[PDB]
Ligand binder design. Structure first.
Ligand SMILES: Nc1ncnc2c1ncn2[C@@H]1O[C@H](COP(=O)(O)OP(=O)(O)OP(=O)(O)O)[C@@H](O)[C@H]1O
Lengths: 295, 251, 108, 212, 212, 109, 108
C-alpha cells in the first residue's frame, strides 16, 4: 500500500545471541519498537486501538537495490524443472545455490517458478568489532555489525494515516535494534507516495496459492486446517524483557513462528499474542500479522 | 610466534559423483552395481575418520569431530598450517588426483566466543567457490588462489627462500617488509606510478648492510621485481609470503 | 610522465655511472621543499622560490660534465617554463623522483 | 513534550591518535594492534563506543557524590544521561552517539598526501642495555574532520531539569578537548577539538536559544 | 576538587638535535634515518614520546630510594605522576603531554632561508686508515619555537601534596635544559630551552600564585 | 648524590682553521668544501662532533694499557667518560658537549 | 629576473669567454655578505655597505675590458640606484646569482 524506504549503515541485528548478527531481522522488532517509544511521547493508548484494526499491518525488512526485493518461495519449484540437463554433478551443485539465496528481485517472481537458478547478489559483508573494559579484570566481548554497500537499502510497507507518519519520524534518530546505546540503528526515512504497479498483489480475502510472510502464526481455530500440504520453516525469536518496573526483567516465553516467504494454501486470520510470564503492570504485545502475495 | 590460534574446516568438495553416476566409461561394464557405489564411502571413511588421528600425531593441535564430511581442527597455527596442506597430499595419492579438496585457515584472538569464531571461518569456505571448484581461501576472502599454486610455488620456492636469504638481517633489516606489502595493494589507482617506486626500495636494503653480507643478497632483487609485473594473480602471492614471515619471528 | 622516464635515462653513453647520489644532495631536496608549501598557500605567493629553483639546475651544468648530459636529454629546463598552475607544478615534483629511483636500480 | 535535540559538530584532530581496532587484515604493515577502518572501503573510522566509554569516565569524577567502584552505580544525577541496569526510574540512554566517519576526503586528495595511516617507530630502555623490543605503532594523520551528532530527547517528565542538563553536556564537550582520546595518550596523542559546535532541531518542538 | 593546569611554554631549540624517524623519505638525498615529521605536510615536528621517556629517566636517579631495574617499578613518590601498570592504587597518569608543532613559520619565511632541515656530514676514524663509512645525518634548524602544553588534573585525593607536586615538575623543566634530547646527542645536539614558562587555568578551580 | 658540573669557557681561535662542512654552497666564490655554519643565519660556528672525536683520540694514547684497534673498545679507565656500545656496565655518557656558537658578533661589527 | 637573463647574457661579441670564474672572486662574495645581514638587522643600518658595494663594480670596469661590456648591457649600475627597501635589495642579490649560472652554461 505504502512503502517506507530506509537505508542502514553500520547497524546490528542479533538472532539468538548478542555476539551473532544477521543481515536482516524479524518483523517483531519493528512492532515492539514503536509501542515502546509511544509511552515516552504521550500516546500509548492511541496506538493500542490502532494495531488491532485488521487493516493495519507491517512488513519485514526487504532489501532495496534499484528495485524492491522479495523472499524466495519455500519449496518452489517442485521436482519438474531441471534447468539444462547436462550431468548429475552440475545439477546437484546448482540446487544449493537457490537454498542459500535470501531474496529475489521484483521481476524474477514469475521466472523463478518456470525454471531459473542463479546466485544471490552480494548485498553486504558481515564485519565484527571488538570492545573491552580496563577497570574490570580486563574482560572483553565480541559483537558483529552490518555494513551495507553497493547502495543497499530497506523498505517497510504499512498503512497511510495521520498518526503513523509521526511515530516513525523519531525512530530514525533513536536507534533500531542491536546496541542502541552507541549509534547502531540511526537511519534516514525516505518518504514516498506511489509504490510500484507490480507490487500490488497484497490480498487477505481469496486463497489462490498464497504465501505468508513476516513470520506467520495461525489461530487456535485454524491450525491444522491450513497446515496440511504446505511449506514452512520453524525459526526462533525470544530474549529478556525490557520494562521499567520489575526489578528483575523476566524472560519472555518462546514463540517459535515461521519464516518470511512460507507457502501454505488457505488464508489465515492473524492475532496478537500476549506474553505474560509472571506478572507485569503492562502487556508485552506482539505483531503476528502475516500478509499474503498472489505470486 | 604470537599468542593466537587458527581454526581450519577441511571439507570434501564434490560428492554427487562417484556415488550416483560417474563410473561410466565403457559400454561393456554397467558400472552401476550397488557394491561398486558402496565401496566409495568405505574407502574414504578410513582416511577422514581413522587416518586423521595418525596424521595429527606429534603436533600442537587437537582434532574435533573427525567425520567423512567436515572436520574441526583447533589449536596453534604452528602445526595446523603444516597439517592442512599435508593432509591433501595424502588424499591425492589415494585418489590418483581425481577428487579436489578445499578448506580455509583463519587465525583469531584469545578468549573469544566460539560461535562467531567457527562461523567466520565457515564463510571463507563458500567464498572459496566463486571461481570454480579447486580454489582456496587463506586468512581473508581476498586471497583466492588454486591451493595447488601454494605448495608448488608459495610454500616451495617463495616462503622457504626468505627463511635462509633474509634471516641474517635483523632489527635494522626488518624495516622494509611492512612497506612493500602496502605497495602490492595500491595497484588499481596507482599502476605505472607504483612501478617506479618499487625500484627505490630494492636499493635501500642493499646499501644499508654489511659489505661482506652483500654476497647473500644477489638474486632476491630480481626475483622480487619479476613477481610484480607478470600476472595479476602472481601479485597476490607475494602478499602471503611476506605475511607468514612476519608472523614467524616477531615480538 | 612515468613512461618516458624508463627508456630515456638508460640511453646514455659510457657505462659505469660516475655521478653518485652524494654530489646531487641539494637540487633533489629543494624541489621537495616546494611541494609541501604549494599545498598550504597559493601559487602567486611562491613566485620567488620558482626563480631560485631554476638557477640551481643551470649552475650545476657548468661545474660537472655529468649534469649537461642529463638536462638536455630529460628536458629539465623546458618543464620549468610550461608550469604556471598549482596542479602543473605538482607534476614536476613527481617527475623528478622517478628519475632517481631508476638511476639507482641500473647503477648507483 | 517530545523534542529531538541534535548536537551537530565537526571533530578536528589536532594530534594524531591511535585506537586499537579488531584483527590485522586491513593494515598488516605494523606489529601491534592497527586502527579499525571500513570493511568495504579503506577509510580510517572511529567507533562510537570510544566516545561514550571515555566521556562518562572523565565526567563522573567531578559531578559525583560517592567513590565509584562499578559502572551504572555511581552518581544518580548523571546516570540518566548514559544508562543504568538497576534503577527503575530510567533505563534507556538519552544521548545517542554515532560513528564519526572521515568526511575530509573531499579535499584531501587535491593536496596530495601519503595515504591514510602512518607508521611511527617506538621502543623502550631497560636502563641496562640499548634498544629493546624494536616495536612500532600506527597513528592517524593530522587535520581530519569527522561527523559527530549527539541526539537528545525529552520524555515528558524531563521538564524542571532541562536547563540543568545543558550545563553538564556543554561542560563535558570542552573537558574532552583537554584530555587524550585514544590509546597511549599519556605522551600526547589524543586531544580533540570540537569545531563549529551548534545545535538544531529536527522534529520541531523546542526553540533554540542556548546555542552557546 | 577538580582543576585543569596547563603549562603553556615555548621550547626554543638552541642547538639542532636529531631523532630517529620512520621511513627515509623526508629528503631524497639522505642515506640514514632522518627525523620524524608530519604525514600530511612536511614540517619538522617533535613527538611527545621522546619527552616523557627522557624527563622521567633524568629525574628518577635523584628522587629515588632504590636502584631501579625495570620501568614502571621504581620510586613510588613519583610513580603517580607518570603511571604504573602494576600498582592497584592508580593506573592513569595525571601528566598528559602534547606533540609540539613548529609554529615559527609565521616569521621564518620573511627572512629567506634554504629550507627546513640541514644535512650534516659525519664519519669515523679506525685509527689505522683514513675516512671510513662516509655516512650523513639530518639535524634541525636553529631558532624554532614549539607549542608545549603539559595538561595536569587532580582527582580529589590530590589534597595534602599539591605543593610538593609543583616542586618536582619545576625541577624537571630546568634539568632537561642541561641535557640533550633525542638520539645520538652525546656530542651536543639536544639541550632545549623553555622560554616563557607560564601556567594558566582553563576550567577555573585552582588559583594561580606559584607561577615562578 | 647528583650534581651538575658545567665547564663554561671561551674558546679563543689564535689561528684560522678549516673544517670540511656540508655542501659547498655557502658562497659562489668557492670550489672546495667550506666551513659548516648556520642554516638559518650566516655565522661561522663549530659543531661538537669534532670536539669529542679529537679530544678522545689524543687522550686515549697516553692513558691506555693496550694497543687500540677499534673505537669504543680501548682503555676501560676512560671508557666510562665518553660511552661504550659493548660494555654492559654503562651505556650513556657523562660528558655532554655543546655546539659552540660564535658570540663575538657583539663587537666585531 | 630569470627570463631576461638567458637572452641578454648570450648576446655578446667575440666568442670564447676570456673572463674566468677566478678573477671575479670578490664582487660575487660581497653581495652574499649583504643578503645574509639584511634579514638580521634593518636597512637603515647597512647604509655604509651599500656605498662600498657600488664602488667595486666601477673599479672593475677600468682594469679589464671583460667588465665594461657586462655592466653596460646588464644595467648593473642602474639597479643599484632603484633599490631603497629591504625587499628590493634582496631581489638584486638573486639576480646576480642568475648571471653566474648561465655564464658557465655556454662556456666557462
Ligand atoms: N563420508 C561420506 N560418505 C558417503 N557419503 C557422504 C559422505 N559425506 C557426505 N556424503 C554425502 O554428501 C551429501 C551432502 O552433500 P552436500 O550437499 O553437502 O555437497 P555440496 O556442499 O553441495 O558440494 P559442493 O560444495 O561441491 O556443491 C549427503 O547426502 C551425503 O550422502
Amino acid at each position: 500500500y505504502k512503502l517506507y524506504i530506509m537505508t542502514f549503515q553500520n547497524a546490528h541485528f542479533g538472532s539468538g545471541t548478542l555476539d551473532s548478527s544477521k543481515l536482516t531481522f524479524s518483523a517483531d522488532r519493528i512492532f515492539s519498537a514503536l509501542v515502546l517509544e509511544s509511552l515516552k511521547m504521550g500516546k500509548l493508548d492511541a496506538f493500542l486501538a490502532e494495531a488491532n484494526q485488521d487493516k493495519f499491518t507491517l512488513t519485514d525488512a526487504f532489501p532495496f537495490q534499484f528495485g524492491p526485493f522479495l523472499p524466495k518461495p519455500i519449496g518452489y519449484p517442485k521436482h519438474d524443472q531441471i534447468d539444462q540437463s547436462v550431468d548429475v554433478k552440475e545439477v546437484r551443485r546448482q540446487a544449493k545455490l537457490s537454498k542459500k539465496l535470501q531474496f529475489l528481485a521484483l521481476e524474477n517472481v514469475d521466472d523463478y517458478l518456470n525454471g531459473e537458478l542463479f546466485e544471490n547478489e552480494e548485498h553486504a559483508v558481515i564485519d565484527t568489532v571488538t570492545k573491552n573494559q580496563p577497570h574490570k579484570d580486563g574482560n572483553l566481548y565480541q559483537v558483529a555489525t552490518t555494513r551495507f554497500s553497493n547502495d543497499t537499502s530497506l523498505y517497510v510497507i504499512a498503512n497511510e494515516s495521520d498518526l503513523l507518519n509521526e511515530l516513525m519520524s523519531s525512530l530514525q534518530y533513536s536507534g533500531l535494534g542491536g546496541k542502541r546505546s552507541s549509534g547502531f540503528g540511526r537511519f534516514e526515512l525516505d518518504i514516498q507516495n506511489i509504490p510500484l504497479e507490480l507490487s500490488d498483489r497484497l490480498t487477505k480475502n481469496h486463497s489462490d496459492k498464497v504465501m505468508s510472510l513476516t513470520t506467520a502464526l495461525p489461530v487456535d481455530a485454524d491450525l491444522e486446517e491450513a497446515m496440511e500440504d504446505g511449506h514452512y520453516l520453524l525459526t526462533k525469536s525470544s530474549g529478556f524483557a525490557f520494562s521499567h518496573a520489575t526489578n528483575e526483567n523476566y524472560r519472555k516465553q518462546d514463540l517459535y513462528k515461521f519464516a518470511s516467504g512460507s507457502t501454505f494454501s488457505k488464508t489465515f486470520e492473524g492475532q496478537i499474542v500476549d506474553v505474560r510470564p509472571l506478572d507485569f503492570p503492562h502487556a508485552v504485545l506482539n505483531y503476528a500479522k502475516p500478509l499474503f502475495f498472489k505470486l | 610466534g604470537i599468542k593466537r590460534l587458527a581454526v581450519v574446516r577441511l571439507d570434501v568438495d564434490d560428492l554427487g559423483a562417484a556415488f550416483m553416476a560417474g563410473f561410466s566409461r565403457q559400454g561393456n561394464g554397467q558400472y552401476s552395481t550397488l557394491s561398486r557405489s558402496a565401496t566409495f564411502s568405505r574407502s574414504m571413511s578410513l582416511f577422514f575418520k581413522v587416518y586423521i588421528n595418525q596424521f595429527a600425531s606429534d603436533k600442537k593441535l587437537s582434532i574435533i569431530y573427525a567425520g567423512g564430511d567436515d572436520v574441526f581442527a583447533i589449536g596453534s597455527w604452528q602445526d595446523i598450517i603444516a597439517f592442512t596442506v599435508e593432509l591433501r597430499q595424502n588424499f591425492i595419492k589415494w585418489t590418483n588426483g581425481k577428487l579436489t579438496l578445499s578448506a580455509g585457515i583463519g587465525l583469531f584472538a584469545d578468549k573469544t566466543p566460539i560461535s562467531l569464531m567457527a562461523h567466520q571461518t565457515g564463510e571463507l569456505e563458500e567464498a572459496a567457490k566463486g571461481n570454480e571448484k579447486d580454489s582456496i581461501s587463506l586468512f581473508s576472502s581476498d586471497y583466492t588462489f588454486k591451493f595447488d599454486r601454494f605448495i608448488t610455488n608459495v610454500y616451495d620456492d617463495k616462503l622457504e627462500q626468505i627463511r635462509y636469504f633474509f634471516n641474517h638481517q635483523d632489527e635494522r633489516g626488518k624495516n622494509f617488509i611492512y612497506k612493500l606489502i602496502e605497495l602490492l595493494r595500491n595497484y588499481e589507482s596507482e599502476e605505472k606510478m607504483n612501478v617506479a617506486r618499487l625500484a627505490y626500495y630494492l636499493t635501500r636494503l642493499e646499501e644499508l648492510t654489511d659489505k661482506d653480507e652483500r654476497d647473500k643478497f644477489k638474486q632476491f632483487k630480481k626475483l622480487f621485481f619479476k613477481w610484480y609485473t607478470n600476472n595479476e594473480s602472481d601479485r597476490k602471492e607475494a602478499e602471503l609470503a611476506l605475511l607468514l614471515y612476519v608472523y614467524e619471528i616477531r615480538k | 610522465k612515468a613512461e618516458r622516464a624508463i627508456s630515456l635515462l638508460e640511453k646514455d653513453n659510457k657505462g659505469n655511472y660516475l655521478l653518485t647520489t652524494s654530489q646531487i644532495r641539494k637540487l633533489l631536496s629543494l624541489c621537495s621543499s616546494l611541494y609541501d608549501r604549494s599545498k598550504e598557500r597559493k601559487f602567486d605567493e611562491l613566485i620567488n622560490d620558482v626563480s631560485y629553483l631554476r638557477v640551481q639546475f643551470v649552475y650545476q651544468a657548468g661545474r660537472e660534465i655529468a649534469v649537461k648530459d642529463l638536462i638536455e636529454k630529460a628536458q629539465i629546463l623546458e618543464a620549468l617554463k610550461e608550469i604556471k598552475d598549482r596542479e602543473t607544478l605538482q607534476r614536476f615534483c613527481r617527475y623528478m623522483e622517478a628519475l632517481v629511483a631508476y638511476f639507482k636500480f641500473y647503477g648507483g | 513534550t517530545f523534542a529531538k535535540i541534535k548536537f551537530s559538530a565537526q571533530i578536528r584532530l589536532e594530534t594524531g591518535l591511535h585506537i586499537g581496532g579488531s584483527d590485522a587484515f586491513a593494515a598488516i604493515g605494523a606489529i601491534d594492534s592497527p586502527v579499525i577502518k571500513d570493511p568495504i572501503t579503506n577509510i580510517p573510522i572511529i567507533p562510537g563506543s570510544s566516545l561514550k566509554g571515555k566521556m562518562r569516565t572523565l565526567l563522573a569524577k567531578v559531578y559525583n557524590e560517592k567513590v565509584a567502584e562499578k559502572p551504572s552505580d555511581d552518581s544518580d544525577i548523571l546516570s540518566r544521561l548514559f544508562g543504568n541496569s538497576k534503577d527503575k526510574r530510567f533505563k534507556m540512554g538519552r544521548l545517542i552517539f554515532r560513528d564519526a566517519f572521515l568526511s575530509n576526503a573531499d579535499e584531501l586528495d587535491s593536496l596530495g598526501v601519503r595515504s591514510y595511516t602512518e607508521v611511527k617507530f617506538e621502543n623502550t630502555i631497560d636502563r641496562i642495555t640499548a634498544e629493546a623490543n624494536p616495536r612500532q605503532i600506527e597513528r592517524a594523520i593530522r587535520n581530519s574532520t569527522f561527523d559527530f551528532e549527539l541526539i537528545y530527547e525529552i520524555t515528558d517528565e524531563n521538564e524542571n531539569q532541562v536547563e540543568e542538563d545543558f550545563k553538564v553536556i556543554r561542560d563535558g564537550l570542552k573537558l574532552l578537548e583537554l584530555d587524550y582520546l585514544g590509546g597511549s595518550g599519556s605522551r600526547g596523542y589524543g586531544k580533540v577539538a570540537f569545531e563549529k559546535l551548534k545545535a538544531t532541531t529536527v522534529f520541531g518542538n523546542y526553540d533554540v536559544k542556548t546555542l552557546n
